[PDB]
Amino acid sequence: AQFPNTPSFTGFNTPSRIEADIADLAHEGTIPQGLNGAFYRVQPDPQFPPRLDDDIAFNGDGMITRFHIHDGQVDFRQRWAKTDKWKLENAAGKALFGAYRNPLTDDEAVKGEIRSTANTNAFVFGGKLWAMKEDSPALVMDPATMETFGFEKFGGKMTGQTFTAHPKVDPKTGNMVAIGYAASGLCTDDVTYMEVSPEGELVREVWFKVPYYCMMHDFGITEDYLVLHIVPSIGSWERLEQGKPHFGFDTTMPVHLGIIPRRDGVRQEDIRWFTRDNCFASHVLNAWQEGTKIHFVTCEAKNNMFPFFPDVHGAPFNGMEAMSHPTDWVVDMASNGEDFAGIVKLSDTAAEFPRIDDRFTGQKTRHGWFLEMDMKRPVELLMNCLFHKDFETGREQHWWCGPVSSLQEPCFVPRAKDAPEGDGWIVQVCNRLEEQRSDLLIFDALDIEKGPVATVNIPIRLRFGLHGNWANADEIGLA
Ligand SMILES: [Fe+3]
């Protein structure tokens, strides 16, 4: 097929569309014998050229990559996430769905169909692989064969239209905690709060309303609460009618933080809202309670981080104000009123794609890992560093991938089920941009600054990834 000659489909964004298997990737260094499991990640990768002359990267069909690490070797498997969209378009031999989150640009033949590309997260839970996209139910797949089952509607018990791509697992119960925004239709202010049991049952779906419709991409959990930030990357049917990107950022609107009790029968009146001045924040490192306080650690920027979801009043993109920093938003449940208790910048390092040792989700975490944008580094062609913060000692570690590479989201892998927090490894894809290929890097998680202990060569150029996760072999049918 002939694709557009635009930045979204050329250079690093050239379509790939490869399904493949490779055993025992070539490598340097020593692949830890203690790793036995798999790292899953997803890349948007268009099956067909877009209906409109220039689509964006966030809109490509989900292609799932798995790195099966065992016995000191890494095997590679890549397969399509076979969404209804993928299947419909494969049958038709052409694109049928249009622009990002814009049903007014779809073929009449797919009116009412689920629009998911399942392209944002590859998450393992309850014996299934979840290929996730926040405008639809999640797609479920077999984590071992990577065949596709279909969308998870919980047998029809799910009443909302959508499911998050940033699920959190509660370490105490083992439940997946999820939201679904735009729950009653596009651009609505209805949201669901859901929990899924380890056995796969939807055990709670609570409907509530938020102050305004916006991109509710991420959230936090604590022991007793779901913590939902309301940030004004807004959208509307009118925007779609006027031919604009679904979302745009409004610098004049306030930011809110909602505290939803994680219990049966929660009502709107049970939800507490805090309010602060405008900023941008997308990803959540973690959240926790301490005394009467809730600590919500996010990557906050002064202004919009999505150039493709532009300022709603026509401002050009401000790259300097898009720089995000790990920041603790602190609210006090024993206070009166809506003011935050604190907004505390935690590092001067510019960072995003935050990760923790997920075994400690919802509890106070000593460690965080991030992709860092170090604008001081040489560049000979930008997420160019891996960044680790020890929040107890304050010590920061950095590893730079060099002047002709960039990095994808890291993932923490525990050494053992009983290992202390952060005792284990970091895995991440590295884009060798000049060489037109990719590496899988493996680090000792608490000494990233010495460099990866193994560099695993991938003889296939991977595309831009979104989110990824590790699961142990006995969780994915590979033991
Ligand atoms: Fe995300």
166: CA distance to ligand 1 center in Å? 7
421: CA distance to ligand 1 center in Å? 23
User: How far apart are alpha carbons 434 and 437 in whole angstroms?
Assistant: 8
Question: Which two structure tokens, joined as six digits, stand for 60?
Answer: 């490509």
User: How far apart are alpha carbons 407 and 369 in whole angstroms?
Assistant: 13
334: CA distance to ligand 1 center in Å? 31
From the list 30, 112, 109, the residue with the least C-alpha distance to 69 is 30
463: CA distance to ligand 1 center in Å? 16
Contacts of residue 59, defined as CB under 8 A and 6 or more positions apart, other chains included, come to 44, 46, 50, 99, 100, 117
Contact 138, 131 (CB under 8 A): yes
Q: Counting Cβ atoms within 10 Å, is residue 69 exposed (0-12), middle (13-18) or buried (19+)?
A: buried
Within 13 Å of residue 72, how many CA atoms lie on the same side as its CB? 4
Query: Can you tell me which residue has the tokens 């296939």?
Result: 460
304: CA distance to ligand 1 center in Å? 15
Q: How far, in whole angstroms, is CA 446 from its chain's centroid? A: 23
Q: Counting Cβ atoms within 10 Å, is residue 17 exposed (0-12), middle (13-18) or buried (19+)?
A: middle
User: How far apart are alpha carbons 122 and 148 in whole angstroms?
Assistant: 13
Chain discontinuities in the chain, listed by preceding residue (C to N exceeding 2.5 Å): 381
What domain range includes position 80?
A: 1-479
398 annotated as a binding-site residue: no
What total of structural domains would you count in the chain? 1
Contact 400, 406 (CB under 8 A): no
Task: Please indicate the experimental technique that yielded this structure.
Answer: X-ray
Residue type, 396: E
256 annotated as a binding-site residue: no
283: CA distance to ligand 1 center in Å? 6
Q: Strand order of the sheet with strand 190-196?
A: 168-169, 176-181, 190-196, 202-209
Question: Which two structure tokens, joined as six digits, stand for 150?
Answer: 């279909």
468: CA distance to ligand 1 center in Å? 10
Q: Is 116 helix (H, G, I), strand (E, B) or coil?
A: coil
246 annotated as a binding-site residue: no
109: CA distance to ligand 1 center in Å? 31
Instruction: Outline where 266-328 has alpha helix (H).
Output: none
117: CA distance to ligand 1 center in Å? 14
Q: How far, in whole angstroms, is CA 378 from its chain's centroid? A: 28
User: How far apart are alpha carbons 409 and 416 in whole angstroms?
Assistant: 22
254: CA distance to ligand 1 center in Å? 22
User: How far apart are alpha carbons 41 and 205 in whole angstroms?
Assistant: 27
335: CA distance to ligand 1 center in Å? 31
Query: Can you tell me which residue has the tokens 């991030």?
Result: 370
Contact 367, 388 (CB under 8 A): yes
From the list 319, 342, 456, 443, the residue with the least C-alpha distance to 387 is 443
Q: Is 272 helix (H, G, I), strand (E, B) or coil?
A: strand
Resolution of this deposited model, Å? 1.6
The conformational region for residue 129 under phi > 0 = left, psi -120 to 50 = alpha, else beta, is beta
User: How far apart are alpha carbons 433 and 271 in whole angstroms?
Assistant: 47
24: CA distance to ligand 1 center in Å? 30
Give 13-19's long-range contacts (Cβ < 8 A, gap of 24+). Answer: 13/57, 13/463, 13/464, 14/461, 15/45, 15/46, 16/43, 16/45, 16/63, 16/460, 16/461, 16/462, 16/463, 17/45, 17/46, 17/47, 17/63, 18/63, 18/78, 18/460, 19/63, 19/78, 19/79, 19/80
User: How far apart are alpha carbons 398 and 356 in whole angstroms?
Assistant: 16
476: CA distance to ligand 1 center in Å? 23
447: CA distance to ligand 1 center in Å? 26
Contact 228, 211 (CB under 8 A): no
User: How far apart are alpha carbons 202 and 167 in whole angstroms?
Assistant: 13
